[PDB]
């Protein structure tokens, strides 16, 4: 049991936090609890302020800020700490009480209760040419000296810590995702039925995705090529809402289905970020620093109001795509395709 720490270069302002990772269940989110330690002998009248800031920064906004768009900011909450002005609210925390007793006097606590409707942390995949200060939705706990006319002096000596909210698995496997379709081309009387399924519903990062594909083709038409892929599409809503269609796992099957015949088998595609290094605009889990992290864990919502949640929502759906072959002007020139899509949620399990 050890506790994080982040001190100002001045050295007066230091902030202690129990954990840097906070998980948000559907019912409630774990509180952001911390303390701040100073030497008030140095400042006779300056105050101590601690804030939780959520920001939907960049995300290719700056390409259009010069005329079209702007960079917004999400929920921000403030608390004063130097004076116990309320003196009435003090739920306190076991960790907070223990740590205060450890440090002793001059340690002043703070507690934040995140509203559940806020989204989880996610960072857009930074392009190598951009090499900037990242992008996406971030949360941050940042502390200032306050109670003064000018904000220039304390801005440099203010402290800031990154904290990112994540969601874990709901450990409850649901109904088997199945997509069944029947296609009539209006040229033939014999249809083709495509039924695809996944092995289970919620997958763990790095676990192979197994797809059960069954095709029954009653007409003379065959399939030239079997197209199998999942895209990581994230709804950047309350915005332009340009849900981006970017694949993450690719599978080519040149197998052909004869007329009035069946094709029955299982494919294994695994999604991983090593191959998608060259890609840009991909959503990925919360980033603390330039240190890298894995693909974005799917964000689940409560089926109540289901209001358009502020920020980024990522959901995973894998397509199976049958393309038929038409030979026009001798060979080739086919331009038809029939695809169905299977949704799934990919996220880490809860550590014990």
């Amino acid at each position, epitope marked *: 049991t050890r506790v994080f720490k982040k001190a100002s270069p001045n050295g007066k302002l230091t902030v202690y936090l129990g954990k840097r990772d906070f998980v948000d269940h559907i019912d409630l989110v774990d509180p952001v609890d911390g303390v701040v330690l100073v030497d008030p002998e140095y400042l006779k009248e300056r105050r101590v302020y601690v804030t939780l800031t959520c920001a939907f920064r960049y995300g290719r906004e700056d390409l259009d800020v010069l005329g079209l768009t702007f960079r917004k900011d999400l929920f921000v909450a403030n608390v004063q700490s130097f004076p116990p002005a309320p003196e009435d609210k003090k739920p306190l925390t076991r960790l907070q009480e223990r740590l205060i007793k450890k440090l002793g006097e001059h340690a002043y606590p703070f507690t934040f209760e995140i509203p559940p409707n806020l989204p989880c942390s996610v960072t857009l995949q930074p392009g190598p040419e951009d090499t900037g200060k990242a992008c996406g939705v971030d949360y941050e706990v940042k502390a200032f000296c306050a109670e003064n006319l000018e904000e220039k002096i304390h801005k440099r000596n203010s402290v800031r810590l990154v904290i990112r909210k994540v969601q874990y698995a709901p450990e409850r496997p649901g109904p088997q995702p199945t997509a069944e379709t029947t296609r009539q081309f209006l040229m033939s009387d014999k249809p083709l039925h495509l039924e695809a399924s996944l092995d289970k519903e919620i997958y763990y*990062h790095g676990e*192979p995705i197994s797809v059960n594909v069954h095709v029954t083709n009653n007409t003379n038409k065959t399939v030239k090529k079997i197209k199998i892929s999942v895209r990581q599409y994230a709804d950047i809503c309350l915005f332009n809402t340009a849900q981006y269609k970017c694949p993450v796992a690719m599978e080519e099957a040149d197998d052909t289905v004869a007329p009035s015949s069946t094709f029955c088998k299982v494919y294994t595609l*695994t999604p*991983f*970020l*090593a*191959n998608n*290094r060259e890609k840009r605009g991909l959503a990925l889990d919360g980033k603390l620093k330039h240190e890298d992290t894995n693909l974005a864990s799917s964000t689940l919502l409560r089926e109540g109001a289901n209001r358009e949640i502020l920020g980024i929502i990522v959901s995973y759906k894998v397509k199976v795509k049958l393309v038929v072959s038409r030979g026009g002007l001798l060979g080739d020139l086919a331009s038809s395709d029939v695809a169905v899509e299977l949704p799934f949620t990919l996220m880490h399990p809860k*550590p014990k």
Partner: single-chain antibody, 227 residues
Framework: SDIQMTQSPSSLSASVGDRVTITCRAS??????VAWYQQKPGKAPKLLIY???SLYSGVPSRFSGSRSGTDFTLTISSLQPEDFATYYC?????????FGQGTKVEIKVQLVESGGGLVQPGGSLRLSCAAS????????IHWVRQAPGKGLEWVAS????????YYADSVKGRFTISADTSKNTAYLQMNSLRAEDTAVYYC?????????????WGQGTLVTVSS
């Protein structure tokens, strides 16, 4: 830099059923990212304590461990005939991973590995361990030495999900590691083996997400060099 980690005592004799402890120190702050390992002689080692506190599932509760600053200690409640072995401790907060010399205590879902034998100076060799029951994108695979009579030394690391491979300092460019994801196998190609690098080589598995030590340990194979 490189973290040098010193374990004490070098060896200890303790009767059966009594308290015993083994200590170790880290040159630079490692921040609870240390693990304690048990090694029966001849057999491959297994994990005891991860995250500097927790006990790996299946280990008896008679084992325990604690930390203080950089001095990290392990406590055994009683000594049974299943206990006497060599105990090791290793740090993983920064690459490279460095183990300790270790302590020899005396009373007084699997993996396969192959590709060992005799080498000549300037020769090459193929070590290969195949994974059964654990995925190649959901687990990182590491290769580690064991020279005869001295503690383990980290050799190489492969992480398929991230696409990065790491090599030990003394062996830059000497060999190459690569994973066949189709067959779920890990290949490691010695090229131009020296005379110093004589050891039995073990490959182990770790969780690619939220590293928690080298849980499933490969049996490994012995290799030697002669002119």
């Amino acid at each position: 830099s490189d973290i040098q980690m010193t374990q004490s005592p070098s060896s200890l004799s303790a009767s059966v059923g009594d308290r015993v402890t083994i200590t170790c120190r880290a040159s630079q702050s490692v921040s609870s990212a240390v693990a304690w390992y048990q090694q029966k002689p001849g057999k491959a080692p297994k994990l005891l304590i991860y995250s500097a506190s927790s006990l790996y599932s299946g280990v008896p509760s008679r084992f325990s461990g604690s930390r203080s600053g950089t001095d990290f200690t392990l406590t055994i409640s009683s000594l049974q005939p299943e206990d006497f072995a060599t105990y090791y401790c290793q740090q993983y907060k920064y690459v490279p991973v460095t183990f300790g010399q270790g302590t020899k205590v005396e009373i007084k879902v699997q993996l396969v590995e192959s590709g060992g034998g005799l080498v000549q100076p300037g020769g090459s060799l193929r070590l290969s361990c195949a994974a059964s029951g654990f995925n190649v994108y959901s687990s990182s695979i590491h290769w580690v030495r064991q020279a005869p009579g001295k503690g383990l030394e980290w050799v190489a690391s492969i992480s398929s999900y991230y696409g990065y491979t790491y090599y030990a300092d003394s062996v830059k460019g000497r060999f190459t590691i690569s994973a066949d994801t189709s067959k779920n196998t890990a290949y490691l190609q010695m090229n131009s083996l020296r005379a110093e690098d004589t050891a039995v080589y073990y490959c182990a598995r770790s969780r690619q997400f939220w590293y928690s030590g080298l849980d499933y340990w490969g049996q490994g194979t012995l290799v030697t060099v002669s002119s």
